[PDB]
Amino acid sequence: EEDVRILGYDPLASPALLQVQIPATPTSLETAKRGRREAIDIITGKDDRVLVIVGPCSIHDLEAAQEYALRLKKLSDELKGDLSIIMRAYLEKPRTVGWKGLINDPDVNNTFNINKGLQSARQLFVNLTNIGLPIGSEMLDTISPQYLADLVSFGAIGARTTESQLHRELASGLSFPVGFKNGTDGTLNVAVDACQAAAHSHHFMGVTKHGVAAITTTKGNEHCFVILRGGKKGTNYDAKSVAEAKAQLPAGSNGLMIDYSHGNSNKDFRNQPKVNDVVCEQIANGENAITGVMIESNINEGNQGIPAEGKAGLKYGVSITDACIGWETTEDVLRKLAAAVRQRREVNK
Amino acid sequence: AEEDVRILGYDPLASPALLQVQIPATPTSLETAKRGRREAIDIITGKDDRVLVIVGPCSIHDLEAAQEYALRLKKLSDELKGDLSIIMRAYLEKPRVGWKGLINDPDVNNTFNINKGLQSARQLFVNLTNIGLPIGSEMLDTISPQYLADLVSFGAIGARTTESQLHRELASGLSFPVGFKNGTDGTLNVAVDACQAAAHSHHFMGVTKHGVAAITTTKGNEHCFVILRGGKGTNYDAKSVAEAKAQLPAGSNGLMIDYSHGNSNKDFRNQPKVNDVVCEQIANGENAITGVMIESNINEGNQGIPAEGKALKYGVSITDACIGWETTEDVLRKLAAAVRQRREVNK
Ligand SMILES: [Mn+2]
């Protein structure tokens, strides 16, 4: 007696199969490799620029996500001297009611279609990296990465998974930098331990490119950093917290990342520009522990819901999960930030 | 196309179906597992006035010592079966800088041999359930359960994974009761939300009995309860259980109290104390307290692995500290009485 709570198994196209059906262009693969290099240099102290993971809370519209990417691309060219921008192309959010994500519900209609979900996911990632814009995503499980890893330049383990052994081992084998968010209870200890663990070699059970379960063995990831995203103990994007933080980072730690939205906003997306100001000062005055910022942005501000009128009737450019600043304001943030960096170069010059 | 740069390689892995044939479950084993699930379900849902007790080593690393313990616990289980419903602990590992647990380093010599690990794991579970003693284990990943689910009567999601979506969906499809431990920061909200989620139906990617990745769909598990194990302070006191019962939504199952970890704050000798403070609330008529987790062994304390390998002191855990057998015999006879006395207060 088992599976009594298992309604059934549906066939799942393997990674290898998907990687052929939706191939990565030479440009796409190049953009991904570049992003990883830049990201690595910045978090390890080799580059004085600031790593910026900015983009929608979650993509549900490949059309709108492509428009946004173009804009963000044209900008990244201009502020490339001070900011290395990776676009947020998260494929969901850890809901509890609400949507499931571009992979669980690609059609936004409670009609699960994982296979089509993975196709959209992969297609999307290819479309974005194809125009020369690196992308970052959240590492949900130990399988999804196999279908998209080749195109990702940055990966972030959510706040509710940083303590999870399973996600630490997963990070210890990813081919890019992985950011661990601090505990949902404001503490920074668990994220420091995640980075410690991901640095080691692990032996876990995963699936191959051919959809088969196998004993995986990782090398260890040394490009794991901490992301500050607030918590119960209050937001932590300020100098005082940044210092408490630096104080906890062990020997050989990488540069800290500060997520403007989420716990560092207190259910008010209009606080991101505020945080930017505070963080931009620390930077403008020689703070070199602050290496990257995480921004939840979009084409139009705010959030919304999934109307009774199916997907066909959803305000365009507007998130359907966490709320975010709109384009206009995003470019501001990125210009004061671009300055905070250009400045910083002197404080240390 | 840069990939697998941090992947040293993939080793072949015997599938669940394969393992289930190489190490078959006796008719007795399968019966013991089904019984335990029934009893556990009745107790946490309020249909039975007994107390569910998940007691046993912090983690098994010796199948021979684990078998001796099971015999003792079995006999005791017989004497106090009128009050307690005993489910032996069969954890393969502890919250990871030391031994990686039976599945990973089965030979206890820093070598990774997962296939032999799974064989020991499964063989063990069979040996235990084979003498009529139900077992409970921690649900590590979304694969290991496939190799052992058929023999497990109870499952617990650790404190470091209760917030993990992946483990909530996993629980929503297990064939037995799953206990969620409260956050490591003493809060009880995350565990209440885990239970909420596991109750729903989920669509995740898992592996079949044939080692293949497939889109799994769960029914939802309604036998998910909360376990109080302390945190940043403890929480087995009446003031804490009272604040807990608050947080549980209508129709929630009886809480479970862990006498160890955060509730024994840096010492195993703190379990007997926690048993009084819990036995009391039971005799005084507290009905939310449906079960307890006890970390015991054949001999007190823990230890480590010497310059020498698995020969280690006998009957002693090599991870978290345990109480001895005798202490365990008292602790359980005492918890038994508190159960009878609670039987009156309600009458
Ligand atoms: Mn978000």
UniProtKB/Swiss-Prot annotation, chain A:
Family: Belongs to the class-I DAHP synthase family.
Induction trigger: By amino acid starvation.
Chemical reaction(s) catalysed: D-erythrose 4-phosphate + phosphoenolpyruvate + H2O = 7-phospho-2-dehydro-3-deoxy-D-arabino-heptonate + phosphate
Functional note: Stereospecific condensation of phosphoenolpyruvate (PEP) and D-erythrose-4-phosphate (E4P) giving rise to 3-deoxy-D-arabino-heptulosonate-7-phosphate (DAHP).
Other facts noted in the record for this chain: Present with 26300 molecules/cell in log phase SD medium.
Gene Ontology CC annotations of this record: cytoplasm; nucleus
NCBIfam families linked: aroFGH, PRK12755.1
Regulation (activators, inhibitors): Inhibited by tyrosine.
The protein's name: Phospho-2-dehydro-3-deoxyheptonate aldolase, tyrosine-inhibited
Any one biological process term the GO annotation gives: aromatic amino acid family biosynthetic process
Alphabetized Pfam families for the sequence: DAHP_synth_1
Domain of life: Eukaryota
A molecular-function term among this protein's GO annotations: 3-deoxy-7-phosphoheptulonate synthase activity
Keywords, sorted A to Z: Acetylation, Amino-acid biosynthesis, Aromatic amino acid biosynthesis, Stress response, Transferase
Pathway: Metabolic intermediate biosynthesis; chorismate biosynthesis; chorismate from D-erythrose 4-phosphate and phosphoenolpyruvate: step 1/7
EC number(s) stated in the UniProt entry for this protein: 2.5.1.54
From Swiss-Prot, chain B:
GO molecular function (one): 3-deoxy-7-phosphoheptulonate synthase activity
Pfam families: DAHP_synth_1 (PF00793)
SUPFAM superfamilies noted in UniProt: Aldolase
Domain of life: Eukaryota
Enzyme class, first EC level, given as a word: transferase
Description of activity control: Inhibited by tyrosine.
Pathway: Metabolic intermediate biosynthesis; chorismate biosynthesis; chorismate from D-erythrose 4-phosphate and phosphoenolpyruvate: step 1/7
Alphabetic keyword roster: Acetylation, Amino-acid biosynthesis, Aromatic amino acid biosynthesis, Stress response, Transferase
GO BP of this protein: amino acid biosynthetic process; aromatic amino acid family biosynthetic process; chorismate biosynthetic process
InterPro entries membership: Aldolase_TIM, DAHP1/KDSA, DAHP_synth_1
Induction: By amino acid starvation.
Catalytic reaction equation(s): D-erythrose 4-phosphate + phosphoenolpyruvate + H2O = 7-phospho-2-dehydro-3-deoxy-D-arabino-heptonate + phosphate
Enzyme Commission number, as recorded: 2.5.1.54
Record has Transferase as a keyword: yes
Database matches in Gene3D superfamilies: Aldolase class I (3.20.20.70)
One GO CC term, this protein: cytoplasm
Keyword presence, Transcription: no
General remark: Present with 26300 molecules/cell in log phase SD medium.
NCBIfam families linked: aroFGH (TIGR00034), PRK12755.1 (NF009395)
Protein role: Stereospecific condensation of phosphoenolpyruvate (PEP) and D-erythrose-4-phosphate (E4P) giving rise to 3-deoxy-D-arabino-heptulosonate-7-phosphate (DAHP).
Similarity comment: Belongs to the class-I DAHP synthase family.
Record's protein name: Phospho-2-dehydro-3-deoxyheptonate aldolase, tyrosine-inhibited
The organism of origin for this protein: Saccharomyces cerevisiae (strain ATCC 204508 / S288c)
